[PDB]
Amino acid sequence: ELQEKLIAVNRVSKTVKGGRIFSFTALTVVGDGNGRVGFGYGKAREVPAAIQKAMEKARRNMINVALNNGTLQHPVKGVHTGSRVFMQPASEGTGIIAGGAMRAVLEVAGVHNVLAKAYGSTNPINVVRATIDGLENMNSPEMVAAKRGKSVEEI
Amino acid sequence: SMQDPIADMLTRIRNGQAANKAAVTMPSSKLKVAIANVLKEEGFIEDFKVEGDTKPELELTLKYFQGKAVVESIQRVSRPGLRIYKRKDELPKVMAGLGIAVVSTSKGVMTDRAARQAGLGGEIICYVA
Amino acid sequence: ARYLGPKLKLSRREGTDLFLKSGVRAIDTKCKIEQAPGQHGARKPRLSDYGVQLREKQKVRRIYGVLERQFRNYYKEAARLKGNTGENLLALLEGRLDNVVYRMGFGATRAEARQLVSHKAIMVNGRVVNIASYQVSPNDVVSIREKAKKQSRVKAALELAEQREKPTWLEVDAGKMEGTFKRKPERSDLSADINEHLIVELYSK
Amino acid sequence: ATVNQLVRKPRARKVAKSNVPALEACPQKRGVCTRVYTTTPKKPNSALRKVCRVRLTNGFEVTSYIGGEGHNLQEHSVILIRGGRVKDLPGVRYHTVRGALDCSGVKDRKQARSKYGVKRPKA
Amino acid sequence: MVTIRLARHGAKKRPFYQVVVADSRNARNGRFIERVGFFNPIASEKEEGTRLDLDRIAHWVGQGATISDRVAALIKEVNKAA
Amino acid sequence: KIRTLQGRVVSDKMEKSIVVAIERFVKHPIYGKFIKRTTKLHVHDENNECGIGDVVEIRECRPLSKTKSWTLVRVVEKAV
RNA sequence: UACCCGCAGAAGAAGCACCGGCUAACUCCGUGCCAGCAGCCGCGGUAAUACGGAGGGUGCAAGCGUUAAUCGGAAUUACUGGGCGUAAAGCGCACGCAGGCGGUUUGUUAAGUCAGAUGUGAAAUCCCCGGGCUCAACCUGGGAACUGCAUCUGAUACUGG
RNA sequence: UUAGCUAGUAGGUGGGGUAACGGCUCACCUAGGCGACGAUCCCUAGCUGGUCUGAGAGGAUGACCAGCCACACUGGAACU
Ligand SMILES: [Mg+2]
Ligand SMILES: [Mg+2]
Ligand SMILES: [Mg+2]
Ligand SMILES: [Mg+2]
Ligand SMILES: [Mg+2]
Ligand SMILES: [Mg+2]
Ligand SMILES: [Mg+2]
Ligand SMILES: [Mg+2]
Ligand SMILES: [Mg+2]
Ligand SMILES: [Mg+2]
Ligand SMILES: [Mg+2]
Ligand SMILES: [Mg+2]
Ligand SMILES: [Mg+2]
Ligand SMILES: [Mg+2]
Ligand SMILES: [Mg+2]
Ligand SMILES: [Mg+2]
Ligand SMILES: [Mg+2]
Ligand SMILES: [Mg+2]
Ligand SMILES: [Mg+2]
Ligand SMILES: [Mg+2]
Ligand SMILES: [Mg+2]
Ligand SMILES: [Mg+2]
Ligand SMILES: [Mg+2]
Question: Considering its fold, how many domains does chain C have in total?
Fold first, then answer.
């Protein structure tokens, strides 16, 4: 059921008395495929240990996204640090047309029909943070009905 | 200066909502009242009141659902520096229909849906969601 | 304008049987099917996202014997057409005359079926058609013409076709050496190990 | 940024500056070799790079690279020039086309022969 | 003067004529007033081949327009089958 | 069937002629702002009744000089 | 001429770029900061998948590479869609003409704006559904579109008078 | 890193002129006309349907086809 994919692995460096210490970082995403997404970021001296720590962190820290039969409710904007993100609900049989970091988030969240675009910095950690936050603040016709005290005739 | 009283009303609402204020008061005008009407009729505010005769003051009772303000976003579209007018077929829909666009038409101030039904166009005052 | 080199090499690179041989023999008895071609065949390719997308497209192209120009035009058309681009691509390939000749069992391979088409041994609705890429429409009758009915290749191929699963969208009369393309095949009629979304992905970047 | 500011002064589109101006939007240019010599490259490289000073048909006098191992080129050699800088040779912004005009192809090349004007060996 | 004639379109060895009302001085495939029909001499005779808006052709003749020997023959052919 | 234009008298110091400015608001083709645009027209005024500042109604006619192809119809408003 | 029939025999018909990362494809030998490569980062001083040959492989294919050229990616002139404390960017400061913008009420006007009607917006091209060449390219029927302009008649909320 | 330009100039009256309106032309009269909503001067350029790219908005472009213009060795001129 849980769909998990590795987004990026980078080699970072810390300087000590006797030279550089190289460590690895792993950025991952986990999801049910029915509106649940979480990202994880792990650090370790070896690549497998880092990908593992990331997956553990990703399994918890999961959020709920109000999907509309494999697509979004409305066009949405996401922002985190240097990454500005835009997502649009597309028609049936179009697929996910997005970059790697956004595509992984949208795949595991279960968003089968998306037109996406990343502006500014394309740093994977802030791109996935901006995407997740964008999907999170996305509201349902039922939520807007509950707020307005009118329901559910938004037509 | 006080060159845009409409953007001020929206900002008074926006800031009041962010500051968890029960109500917001501002100097009144017919146009501010016409927008206050559309906001109330669409469930974005509780109720509005115009007190005074010589110096009218418009008060709006803000709406809070659960831990949050009802007005998520409220932006000025047409403004003194750049006027935005759209035809019936060019009318914008906020949040793919989940929000409202306040339009000023030949037959008064109404929502995007209302103007579309009435076959009208006009000045796009603001977007509310 | 046709791949003429060793055929089993293509199956070995894709890591699946591409039916480039008749099927008389088990693929493993003719080649090391589980190993890639060349000096570094046993090498495990830690294939990139681009690499998996490319390999899927190559696999599908190698099955039908289509080169890049005609295949990229098949995609352009699959996209232009209404509905699922991935599905439209598979239907366009499946509608090719050389493919239909193979699916009816007149040729042992798509390459044999292609030779039958080119060598003017195939008729569509009583009219001679020698274009491999010819798009066969529903209710069309593809037949081995009278002068080619005697060919031992055709008889041998219909025998091998009996050993393969029967295509639901075709009505073949083995005795007459004629068949009817009843309808376009649905996605559920074609192989599940074809990941056409990777091909749709490859042509959208 | 102001709508009023853009009405007065519209958005100015930057004009693209060419890295091959002596070509003047031509795939190649013909010229005569003025000097045929060697030059040492930039940090961190070291070599005796084969270059030529060429006077082109349009009057431009440029420096061009002579790629491959060995060349027959001397002063008064009529050569064909194409775009392409030599990263560690500042000023070198063009390449001589091997196997065209007075420029011979590279001797005994087997791989990438098209790039060095070498015809298919008889075998 | 104003003439009703054929403009040679189609392709090499497969012509397709366009019946046009035009000032005789313009080029054959050039400036025209009205498209008043078409003529396919390579038509498979199964479904269409020659179509003419005879109501507009007569309007133009009624206003002084001449007709080419080929277009006049096509009017005779359309007034023989239909 | 009477196509007409309206504007204010910019010049009257011309024998049997006047200069009229037709002002309009136009949406900027790029930046969408509504910009003021003026059209100065050399207009025929026989009898010289139109004065500087007067709002006048004008119609298009045949050429009356090298710069005049417009003539006065009525004086809409006069003396500010 | 298209096209159809007959004859003989696999016979007469495969090359080009690439394989260090970006980027699909790895080894040996030669060379030794040389000779040379290089779109960008960068390769070369004895284990060089980066030079040159070879074997193997990858990608295209009657083409393949290279150079030139436009737009894209470039939200990198940002109208849609950017910015100016320390990264490029607030004029050293003020007054102020033109210009831009302008509180609130009523009446009036109807220029902007909005609505409808009518005319026009050539054909071809693009797109859609068809038809014809064995297929395709190509040719072609009908439609859609030409998001525009103009005139006339209305609406009067907002902007202007 | 061009701010002022203009004497047939801008308008009037009458005569002439053209197929036709008109400073088109001439005599006389008035002193206008244009311009920071960019005149004048300088540089470049045939214009369009469209073409290429782009999700669009744009950007770039005006071979082949079709429409309009202009030219016909260079400068001038009329004749039919
Ligand atoms: Mg950046
Ligand atoms: Mg080809
Ligand atoms: Mg690789
Ligand atoms: Mg190389
Ligand atoms: Mg070595
Ligand atoms: Mg380029
Ligand atoms: Mg741009
Ligand atoms: Mg910036
Ligand atoms: Mg400080
Ligand atoms: Mg600074
Ligand atoms: Mg300061
Ligand atoms: Mg009234
Ligand atoms: Mg048209
Ligand atoms: Mg057909
Ligand atoms: Mg057509
Ligand atoms: Mg038509
Ligand atoms: Mg008013
Ligand atoms: Mg006169
Ligand atoms: Mg010129
Ligand atoms: Mg020519
Ligand atoms: Mg032309
Ligand atoms: Mg002429
Ligand atoms: Mg002359």
Answer: 2
Is residue C2, in this structure, part of any structural domain at all?
Answer: no
Do C130 and C166 lie in a common domain?
yes
Question: Who's near B68: CB < 8 A, 6+ residues apart?
Answer: none
Say if CB C13 and CB C3 are below 8 A apart.
no
Place of tokens 């008395």: A17
Place of tokens 């553990």: A56
CB contact under 8 A, C204 and A97: yes
In one letter, which amino acid is C168?
A: T
Residue D9 contacts strand G, CB under 7 A: no
Total number of domains in chain D? 1
In a domain, C85, yes or no: yes
**Domain segments of chain B as ranges:** 1-71, 72-129
Long-range CB pairs of B15-20, under 8 A, 24+ apart, other chains included: B16/B62, B17/B62, B17/B69, B17/B70, B17/B71, B18/B69, B20/B64, B20/B69
Query: What are residue F74's DSSP bridge partners?
Result: F57
Ordered alpha helix ranges (H), chain E: 54-61, 69-81
* Closest among D70, D74, D94 to D33, alpha carbons compared: D74
How far apart (Å, rounded) are the C-alpha atoms in residues C57 and C203?
10
Tell me whether residue A72 is exposed, middle or buried, using C-beta atoms within 10 angstroms of its C-beta: 0 to 12, 13 to 18, 19 or more.
Answer: buried
Domain containing C175 equals 94-181
Could you tell me if A56 and A40 are in contact, meaning their C-beta atoms sit under 8 angstroms apart? Answer: yes
Tokens at residue D65, please?
A: 């690279």
Task: Find tokens 């006077």 and name the residue.
Answer: D55
Rg (CA), chain E: 13
Contact A6, A51 (CB under 8 A): yes
CATH number at residue D56: 2.40.50.140
Q: Are residues C15 and C70 located together in one domain of the fold?
A: yes
User: Cβ of C83 and A95 within 8 Å?
Assistant: no
| Calpha distance C159→F71 (Å, rounded) | 96
Helix axis angle, C49-64 to C68-80, nearest 10°: 100
Q: Which CATH number fits domain B1-71: 1.10.8.870, 3.90.960.10, 3.30.1370.30, 3.30.470.30?
A: 3.30.1370.30
D2/B82 touch (CB, cutoff 8 Å), yes or no: no
Closest CA to D20 of D101, D86, D76, D74: D86
Resolution in A: 2.8
How far is residue C30's CA from residue B79's CA, in Å, rounded to a whole number? Answer: 77
- Is the domain of C138 the same as that of C109? yes
The answer to whether the beta carbons of residues C85 and A97 sit under 8 Å apart is no
Range(s) of the domain holding residue D37: 1-123
Asked whether residue C74 falls in the same domain as residue C153, the answer is: no
Cα distance between residue A18 and residue B73, in whole Å: 54
Asked whether the beta carbons of A154 and A145 are under 8 A apart, the reply is yes
- Which residues face B69 on adjacent strands? B64
C-alpha to C-alpha distance for C30 and C40, rounded to whole angstroms: 20
Experimental method: X-ray
The tally of CA atoms less than 13 A away on the side-chain side of residue D63 is 13
Question: Do A71 and A96 meet the contact criterion of CB atoms below 8 Å apart?
Answer: no
Tell me phi and psi for residue B98, to 5 degrees. -75, -10
Are C95 and C133 spatial neighbours (Cβ–Cβ below 8 Å)?
no
User: What is the CATH number for C138?
Assistant: 3.10.290.10
Cα–Cα dist F7/F25, whole Å: 13
Residue C144 lies in a domain: yes
Q: Which chain G positions have some atom within 7 A of a protein CB?
A: 4-6, 14-19, 22-27, 33-44, 52-62, 64-71, 74-79, 82-84, 99-106, 111-116, 122-123, 127-129, 131-136, 138-142, 151-152, 154-159
Let me know the angle formed at the C-alpha of C86 by C82 and C89, rounded to the nearest 5 degrees. 80
State the CATH number of the domain containing residue C78: 1.10.1050.10
